[PDB]
């Protein structure tokens, strides 16, 4: 029900199903530039898939595998998973990205999960409409942790975004925190969320109604701090201003947040 491939393997399969690109989040971009390179690339890929038994002698890719990749490249509903982490002590960051794709039209498989780490990507076919299987998937990128404990607090989303920008541009952390205007109780958590190591997963949802693709204007973050996991979920207030809520990152809380996040879409997810 799962397969692990190199990004190059995956790209070749994507060409096979006529996909212009992979979803942006994955960062699986065309690996070659010219006719000469393509030929070499194709030769290499055909031999490799073949050695793996992915490519049959008749020249066809395992339809199940090809289909999964078709779902990832042409999703009706999806969740992007952008993992962010403290760079390794080698001066570099490796890529850890994911997408949760579900397809419709006829209602083995319900949806496909693609997770890309460095030069490899794995595709897993599963029922993604269950939070007891879906929520765990999100965490693999994250360091294993328990939900942090604190009283929930909120702040306008615009304010939060601006603070992050200021912080990233050199405004010192204390000053930025003062800018937030949150309660003293809240301060320890926000500092954990904003500063230091800075390690999390950012999630955005999307859907493809008719031929129009729409994505959420906002996304949630599952952050992990020294204190524990912190969930930053957005909601719109009565006056319509966006508000961000920092709550303990329990599985239930994360699951409800995802459901609410999807709710905004015209016809997306469940």
Swiss-Prot record:
GO terms for cellular component: cytoplasm. Pfam families: ESX-1_EspG. Keywords: Chaperone, Cytoplasm. Transmembrane segments: none annotated. The keyword Transcription regulation does not apply. It is found in: Cytoplasm. Specific chaperone for cognate PE/PPE proteins. Plays an important role in preventing aggregation of PE/PPE dimers. Interacts specifically with ESX-3-dependent PE/PPE proteins. Belongs to the EspG family. This is ESX-3 secretion-associated protein EspG3. It comes from Mycobacterium tuberculosis (strain ATCC 25618 / H37Rv). The lineage of its organism: Bacteria, Bacillati, Actinomycetota, Actinomycetes, Mycobacteriales.
């Amino acid at each position: 029900n799962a397969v692990e491939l190199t990004v190059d393997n995956a790209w070749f399969i994507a060409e096979t199903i006529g996909a212009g690109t992979f979803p942006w989040v994955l960062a699986i971009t065309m690996p070659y530039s010219d006719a000469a390179q393509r030929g070499a690339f194709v030769d290499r890929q055909r031999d490799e898939l073949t050695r793996m038994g992915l490519l049959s002698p008749q020249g066809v890719i395992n339809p199940a595998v090809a289909d999964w990749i078709k779902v990832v490249c042409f999703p009706d509903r999806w969740l992007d998973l952008r993992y962010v982490g403290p760079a390794s002590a080698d001066g570099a960051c490796e890529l850890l990205r994911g997408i949760v794709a579900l397809r419709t039209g006829t209602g083995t498989g319900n949806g496909v999960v693609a997770l890309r780490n460095a030069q490899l990507v794995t595709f897993t076919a599963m029922d993604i409409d269950d939070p007891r299987a879906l929520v765990p998937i999100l965490g693999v990128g994250l360091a294993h942790r328990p939900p942090a404990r604190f009283d929930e607090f909120s702040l306008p989303t615009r304010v939060g975004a601006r603070a992050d920008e200021r912080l990233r541009s050199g405004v010192p952390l204390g000053e930025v925190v003062d800018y937030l205007g949150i309660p003293a109780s809240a301060r320890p958590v926000v500092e954990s969320v904003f500063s230091g190591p800075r390690s999390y997963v950012e999630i955005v949802a999307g859907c493809n109604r008719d031929g129009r693709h729409t994505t959420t204007e906002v996304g949630l973050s599952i952050v992990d701090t020294s204190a524990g996991r912190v969930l930053v979920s957005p909601s719109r207030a009565f006056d319509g201003e966006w508000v961000s809520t920092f709550s303990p990152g329990t599985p239930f809380a994360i699951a409800v947040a995802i459901q609410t996040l999807t709710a905004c879409l015209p016809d997306g997810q469940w």
